[PDB]
Amino acid sequence: SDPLLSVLMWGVNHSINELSHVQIPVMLMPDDFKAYSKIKVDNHLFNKENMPSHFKFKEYCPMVFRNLRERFGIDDQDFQNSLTRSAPLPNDSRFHTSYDKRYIIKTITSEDVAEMHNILKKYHQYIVECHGITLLPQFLGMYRLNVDGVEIYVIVTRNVFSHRLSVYRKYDLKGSTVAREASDKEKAKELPTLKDNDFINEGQKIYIDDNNKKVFLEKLKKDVEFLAQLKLMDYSLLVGIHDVERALAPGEFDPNIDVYGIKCHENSPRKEVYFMAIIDILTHVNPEQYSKRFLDFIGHIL
Amino acid sequence: SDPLLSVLMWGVNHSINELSHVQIPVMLMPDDFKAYSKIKVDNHLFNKENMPSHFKFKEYCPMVFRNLRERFGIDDQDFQNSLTRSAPLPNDSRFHTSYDKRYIIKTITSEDVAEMHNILKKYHQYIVECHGITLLPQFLGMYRLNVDGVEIYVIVTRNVFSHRLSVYRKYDLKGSTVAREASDKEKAKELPTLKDNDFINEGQKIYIDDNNKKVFLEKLKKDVEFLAQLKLMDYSLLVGIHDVERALAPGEFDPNIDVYGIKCHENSPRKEVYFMAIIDILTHVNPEQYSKRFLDFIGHIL
Ligand SMILES: CC(=O)c1c(C)c2cnc(Nc3ccc(N4CCNCC4)cn3)nc2n(C2CCCC2)c1=O
Ligand SMILES: CC(=O)c1c(C)c2cnc(Nc3ccc(N4CCNCC4)cn3)nc2n(C2CCCC2)c1=O
């Protein structure tokens, strides 16, 4: 009963079925980065229960995104199911998550789409270079939906948080000089999103061991410098904490599905798993400063 | 490598997948007879190996045709497979048959489409009345294909002939006053299509028993009178003879797939199965005369 949502599900379904007939090459050509597929549907006096009568659906660079999915260890059939088997769920009073909590579906602006197009080749090559091991967003699909006059753009990414294990505390850190704090309107929703100073206040610590910390920051440095290089800024580190005590394995996670998980070290006051990655990178006081400033912060909290 | 053919296969595939999400009602509404679905595809720098970059596909009254398929004992998944699993084969120097010889795919004119629309409700009701037992064409699907500038209309019907058992001799009878005979250009192709006088010459007999003859002509009368009633004429009886001696069951056929089969009677000079039905009905000296004249002929040859 959300028409835009059902066009998306329809669109992803259509998209993955078409690609299932297209031979997967090992390389992308420069044209794959300029490519798209467009489908206009006009149903007259037919199929009213499921679909709108008039909708358009556009996928950007379908070959590039399939290549990315593969590189992030995502199988097209699973991706299709996660997005289609049952409707994605809305998240605030905004974004959606797939019914299985695996994927995030964010509405973005035509500006954001333009920027994504702009960085896609370099983004792809970066993913190739690091063999998919990164704390960058994992962009999996990018679409344009049209439902009789309304036009929206969506991007699909991997969830930073676990699909199984809940997260009682969420942070969003930038390490900025200006003060960042959470709304009391937000604090009163079951799961709030705290910011820099909610953290830098109530004594929040991340208990990971020195190897795990080394790996993470090495990754973060490479990622962040690549973002700097692209003149990108205003991105956050999304930090989620799962308290094992409150909520198969009786506390362990699948490291091949919940890629951003790190177990706490043995002397950790409480049994905790952490989920950390970069989010929200498509905004284009300066990029080169922001990067090292962001890195300073994350170092001092870990 | 025939673009129009691959849009058809693409279109049937798309059509049956969509309908698989639509609830099947037991009744059609008057709007189902005015309905259609339209899909415009624009691929830029994508999917060139399989599809054209720009094509349109239109299905007419998709609910009505699905209802007909069901009434003729055809399952949508099978129909999808017969048309998609492998390309339909061309037939002359015209029409196509599905790779499994079950369905015929004829190109028709916009006139023919208009006439089909015109008779569809009455056609449907007739099929309902006779519980699908008829010698009329079984119309299963009707489409419009557009491949960059070229526009064609196709209709899909059940084959009059068997999908397994070959047919060494084919006739096409109208019972007309003017002389009808086959071309020598035709006679020289492996399987010719003989006409009224090729039959009325070389002593062709149809050896069926008196019950089978009674059933057939009762059917034929009802069918033909319905065609008359619609002011339709210029239709033929397509007669195919299978010689058991020349070419599982060692001579018997599936009466649920090869619906138009009749075994010969026990005293038949040779072991023969006959395949007879009406074809080519969409041309709109008069209809009422043609009918009884057609019936006179078929009576005198059986
Ligand atoms: C496109 C992004 O960079 C991006 C990613 C990758 C992402 C990944 N996992 C998320 N997983 C999340 C993020 C937040 C929650 N919450 C649960 C309850 N509501 C408040 C926060 C749950 N799951 N959220 C993500 N976002 C969201 C934050 C901005 C709007 C979408 C994103 O932009
Ligand atoms: C739309 C029709 O009325 C119709 C039907 C139902 C039909 C059914 N079975 C056929 N089965 C046939 C008909 C003819 C052959 N031949 C095999 C070799 N070439 C010569 C004839 C094989 N199978 N052919 C049919 N035709 C054809 C005759 C006119 C053009 C299509 C049709 O119009």
Side-chain angles (χ1 to χ4, degrees), chain B residues 91-92 95 104 137-139 155 157-161 192-193 238 278-281:
Chain B
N91 262 252
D92 297 290
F95 69 93
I104 305 305
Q138 299 191 347
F139 299 120
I155 196 144
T157 56
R158 204 204 267 275
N159 194 356
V160 174
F161 303 149
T193 294
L238 182 64
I278 307 167
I279 70 168
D280 190 27
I281 70 163

Short mmCIF file of all heavy atoms in Angstrom, two decimals, chain B residues 91-92 94-95 104 106 137-139 155 157-161 170 191-193 238 278-281, ligand 2, unseen atoms left out:
data_model
loop_
_atom_site.label_atom_id
_atom_site.label_comp_id
_atom_site.label_asym_id
_atom_site.label_seq_id
_atom_site.Cartn_x
_atom_site.Cartn_y
_atom_site.Cartn_z
N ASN B 91 8.62 -21.25 -40.38
CA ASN B 91 7.98 -22.37 -41.05
C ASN B 91 7.93 -22.43 -42.57
O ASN B 91 7.72 -23.52 -43.13
CB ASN B 91 6.61 -22.67 -40.45
CG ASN B 91 6.68 -23.80 -39.44
OD1 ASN B 91 6.19 -24.91 -39.70
ND2 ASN B 91 7.31 -23.55 -38.29
N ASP B 92 8.12 -21.31 -43.25
CA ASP B 92 8.11 -21.31 -44.71
C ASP B 92 9.18 -20.38 -45.31
O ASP B 92 10.09 -19.94 -44.60
CB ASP B 92 6.70 -21.03 -45.25
CG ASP B 92 5.68 -22.11 -44.85
OD1 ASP B 92 5.76 -23.25 -45.36
OD2 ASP B 92 4.79 -21.82 -44.03
N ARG B 94 3.23 -16.50 -43.44
CA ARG B 94 4.21 -17.28 -42.68
C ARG B 94 3.86 -17.34 -41.19
O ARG B 94 3.10 -16.51 -40.67
CB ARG B 94 5.63 -16.73 -42.88
N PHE B 95 4.44 -18.32 -40.50
CA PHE B 95 4.19 -18.50 -39.08
C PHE B 95 5.36 -19.15 -38.37
O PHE B 95 6.34 -19.50 -38.99
CB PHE B 95 2.88 -19.28 -38.85
CG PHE B 95 2.95 -20.73 -39.26
CD1 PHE B 95 3.28 -21.71 -38.34
CD2 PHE B 95 2.67 -21.10 -40.57
CE1 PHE B 95 3.35 -23.05 -38.71
CE2 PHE B 95 2.74 -22.44 -40.96
CZ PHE B 95 3.08 -23.41 -40.02
N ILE B 104 1.27 -22.44 -32.18
CA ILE B 104 1.49 -21.73 -33.42
C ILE B 104 1.50 -20.25 -33.10
O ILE B 104 0.71 -19.80 -32.27
CB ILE B 104 0.39 -22.05 -34.45
CG1 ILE B 104 0.27 -23.56 -34.67
CG2 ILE B 104 0.61 -21.30 -35.75
CD1 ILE B 104 1.55 -24.28 -35.07
N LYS B 106 1.39 -16.75 -35.17
CA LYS B 106 1.13 -16.16 -36.48
C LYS B 106 1.20 -14.65 -36.36
O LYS B 106 0.76 -14.09 -35.36
CB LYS B 106 -0.24 -16.58 -37.00
CG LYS B 106 -0.51 -16.22 -38.45
CD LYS B 106 -1.96 -16.49 -38.84
N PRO B 137 -10.30 -22.27 -33.49
CA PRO B 137 -8.96 -21.95 -33.00
C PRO B 137 -8.97 -21.69 -31.50
O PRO B 137 -9.94 -21.14 -30.98
CB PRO B 137 -8.62 -20.69 -33.75
CG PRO B 137 -9.32 -20.86 -35.06
CD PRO B 137 -10.63 -21.51 -34.71
N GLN B 138 -7.91 -22.12 -30.81
CA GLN B 138 -7.77 -21.82 -29.41
C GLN B 138 -6.82 -20.66 -29.29
O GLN B 138 -5.62 -20.83 -29.36
CB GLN B 138 -7.26 -23.04 -28.64
CG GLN B 138 -8.21 -24.23 -28.73
CD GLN B 138 -7.89 -25.35 -27.78
OE1 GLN B 138 -6.82 -25.41 -27.16
NE2 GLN B 138 -8.82 -26.27 -27.66
N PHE B 139 -7.37 -19.47 -29.12
CA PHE B 139 -6.56 -18.27 -28.99
C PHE B 139 -6.02 -18.20 -27.58
O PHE B 139 -6.79 -18.19 -26.62
CB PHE B 139 -7.41 -17.05 -29.31
CG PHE B 139 -7.97 -17.05 -30.70
CD1 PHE B 139 -9.35 -17.03 -30.91
CD2 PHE B 139 -7.12 -17.05 -31.81
CE1 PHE B 139 -9.87 -17.01 -32.20
CE2 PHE B 139 -7.64 -17.03 -33.10
CZ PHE B 139 -9.01 -17.01 -33.30
N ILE B 155 -0.56 -13.43 -32.82
CA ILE B 155 -1.52 -14.25 -32.06
C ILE B 155 -0.95 -15.66 -31.85
O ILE B 155 -0.28 -16.21 -32.73
CB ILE B 155 -2.94 -14.24 -32.69
CG1 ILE B 155 -3.97 -14.75 -31.70
CG2 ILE B 155 -3.00 -15.03 -34.00
CD1 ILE B 155 -5.31 -14.05 -31.78
N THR B 157 -1.86 -19.65 -30.91
CA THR B 157 -2.93 -20.66 -30.87
C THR B 157 -2.35 -22.03 -30.63
O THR B 157 -1.14 -22.24 -30.79
CB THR B 157 -3.69 -20.76 -32.21
OG1 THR B 157 -2.76 -21.04 -33.26
CG2 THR B 157 -4.41 -19.48 -32.52
N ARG B 158 -3.22 -22.97 -30.26
CA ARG B 158 -2.83 -24.38 -30.17
C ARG B 158 -2.67 -24.96 -31.57
O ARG B 158 -3.47 -24.64 -32.48
CB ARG B 158 -3.86 -25.19 -29.40
CG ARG B 158 -3.26 -26.44 -28.79
CD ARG B 158 -4.32 -27.49 -28.56
NE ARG B 158 -4.87 -27.41 -27.21
CZ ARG B 158 -4.33 -27.99 -26.14
NH1 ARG B 158 -3.20 -28.68 -26.22
NH2 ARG B 158 -4.93 -27.84 -24.97
N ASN B 159 -1.64 -25.80 -31.74
CA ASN B 159 -1.39 -26.47 -33.01
C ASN B 159 -2.53 -27.45 -33.24
O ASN B 159 -3.00 -28.09 -32.29
CB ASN B 159 -0.07 -27.23 -32.95
CG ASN B 159 0.42 -27.67 -34.31
OD1 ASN B 159 -0.24 -27.47 -35.34
ND2 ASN B 159 1.60 -28.26 -34.34
N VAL B 160 -2.98 -27.56 -34.49
CA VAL B 160 -4.02 -28.54 -34.83
C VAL B 160 -3.39 -29.93 -34.87
O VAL B 160 -4.01 -30.93 -34.52
CB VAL B 160 -4.71 -28.22 -36.18
CG1 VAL B 160 -5.67 -29.33 -36.56
CG2 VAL B 160 -5.45 -26.89 -36.10
N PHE B 161 -2.12 -29.96 -35.27
CA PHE B 161 -1.39 -31.21 -35.40
C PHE B 161 -0.77 -31.60 -34.09
O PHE B 161 -0.68 -30.78 -33.18
CB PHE B 161 -0.33 -31.11 -36.50
CG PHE B 161 -0.88 -30.71 -37.84
CD1 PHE B 161 -0.12 -29.97 -38.73
CD2 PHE B 161 -2.17 -31.10 -38.23
CE1 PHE B 161 -0.63 -29.61 -39.97
CE2 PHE B 161 -2.68 -30.74 -39.46
CZ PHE B 161 -1.91 -29.99 -40.33
N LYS B 170 -1.33 -32.97 -45.53
CA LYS B 170 -2.05 -31.84 -44.97
C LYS B 170 -3.06 -31.33 -46.00
O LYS B 170 -2.71 -31.12 -47.15
CB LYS B 170 -1.08 -30.72 -44.59
CG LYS B 170 0.08 -31.12 -43.68
N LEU B 191 6.98 -31.02 -46.87
CA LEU B 191 5.57 -31.10 -46.47
C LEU B 191 4.71 -30.03 -47.15
O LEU B 191 4.70 -28.87 -46.74
CB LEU B 191 5.43 -31.03 -44.94
N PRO B 192 4.00 -30.42 -48.23
CA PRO B 192 3.06 -29.50 -48.90
C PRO B 192 1.75 -29.29 -48.14
O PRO B 192 1.45 -30.06 -47.22
CB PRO B 192 2.79 -30.19 -50.24
CG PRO B 192 3.10 -31.63 -50.03
CD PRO B 192 4.11 -31.72 -48.92
N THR B 193 1.00 -28.26 -48.52
CA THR B 193 -0.36 -28.01 -48.00
C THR B 193 -1.36 -28.09 -49.14
O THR B 193 -1.56 -27.12 -49.88
CB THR B 193 -0.46 -26.63 -47.28
OG1 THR B 193 0.35 -26.64 -46.10
CG2 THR B 193 -1.89 -26.33 -46.87
N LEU B 238 -8.60 -27.59 -41.36
CA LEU B 238 -7.25 -28.10 -41.54
C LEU B 238 -7.25 -29.58 -41.24
O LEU B 238 -7.53 -29.99 -40.11
CB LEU B 238 -6.28 -27.36 -40.62
CG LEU B 238 -4.80 -27.73 -40.73
CD1 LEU B 238 -4.27 -27.38 -42.11
CD2 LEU B 238 -3.98 -27.04 -39.65
N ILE B 278 -10.85 -26.12 -37.18
CA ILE B 278 -11.02 -24.91 -37.99
C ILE B 278 -9.83 -23.97 -37.80
O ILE B 278 -9.26 -23.88 -36.70
CB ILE B 278 -12.36 -24.20 -37.71
CG1 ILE B 278 -13.53 -25.19 -37.83
CG2 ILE B 278 -12.58 -23.03 -38.65
CD1 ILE B 278 -14.84 -24.67 -37.27
N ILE B 279 -9.42 -23.33 -38.89
CA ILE B 279 -8.36 -22.33 -38.83
C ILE B 279 -8.78 -21.11 -39.61
O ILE B 279 -9.67 -21.20 -40.46
CB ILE B 279 -7.00 -22.83 -39.40
CG1 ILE B 279 -7.06 -23.00 -40.94
CG2 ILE B 279 -6.50 -24.06 -38.65
CD1 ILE B 279 -5.72 -23.21 -41.62
N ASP B 280 -8.13 -19.99 -39.29
CA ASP B 280 -8.13 -18.78 -40.10
C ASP B 280 -9.54 -18.21 -40.21
O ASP B 280 -10.18 -18.27 -41.26
CB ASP B 280 -7.50 -19.07 -41.47
CG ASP B 280 -7.24 -17.81 -42.29
OD1 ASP B 280 -7.06 -16.72 -41.69
OD2 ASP B 280 -7.22 -17.91 -43.54
N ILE B 281 -10.02 -17.65 -39.10
CA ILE B 281 -11.41 -17.24 -39.00
C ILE B 281 -11.65 -15.74 -39.03
O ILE B 281 -12.80 -15.31 -39.10
CB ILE B 281 -12.08 -17.83 -37.74
CG1 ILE B 281 -11.53 -17.19 -36.45
CG2 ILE B 281 -11.94 -19.35 -37.74
CD1 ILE B 281 -12.41 -17.40 -35.23
C1 LIG C 2 -4.68 -18.80 -36.20
C2 LIG C 2 -5.24 -20.06 -36.90
O1 LIG C 2 -6.43 -20.14 -37.19
C3 LIG C 2 -4.30 -21.09 -37.16
C4 LIG C 2 -4.21 -22.24 -36.34
C5 LIG C 2 -5.06 -22.44 -35.22
C6 LIG C 2 -3.26 -23.22 -36.65
C7 LIG C 2 -3.12 -24.37 -35.89
N1 LIG C 2 -2.16 -25.33 -36.24
C8 LIG C 2 -1.37 -25.15 -37.30
N2 LIG C 2 -0.47 -26.12 -37.55
C9 LIG C 2 0.22 -26.28 -38.70
C10 LIG C 2 -0.23 -25.83 -39.95
C11 LIG C 2 0.53 -26.06 -41.10
C12 LIG C 2 1.75 -26.76 -41.03
N3 LIG C 2 2.51 -26.98 -42.14
C13 LIG C 2 3.84 -27.68 -42.00
C14 LIG C 2 4.80 -27.44 -43.17
N4 LIG C 2 4.47 -26.19 -43.89
C15 LIG C 2 3.13 -26.25 -44.51
C16 LIG C 2 2.01 -26.53 -43.48
C17 LIG C 2 2.18 -27.20 -39.77
N5 LIG C 2 1.39 -26.95 -38.62
N6 LIG C 2 -1.50 -24.03 -38.03
C18 LIG C 2 -2.42 -23.07 -37.76
N7 LIG C 2 -2.50 -21.96 -38.54
C19 LIG C 2 -1.51 -21.92 -39.70
C20 LIG C 2 -2.14 -22.00 -41.08
C21 LIG C 2 -2.11 -20.57 -41.60
C22 LIG C 2 -0.79 -20.01 -41.05
C23 LIG C 2 -0.61 -20.66 -39.68
C24 LIG C 2 -3.42 -20.98 -38.26
O2 LIG C 2 -3.50 -19.97 -38.98
#
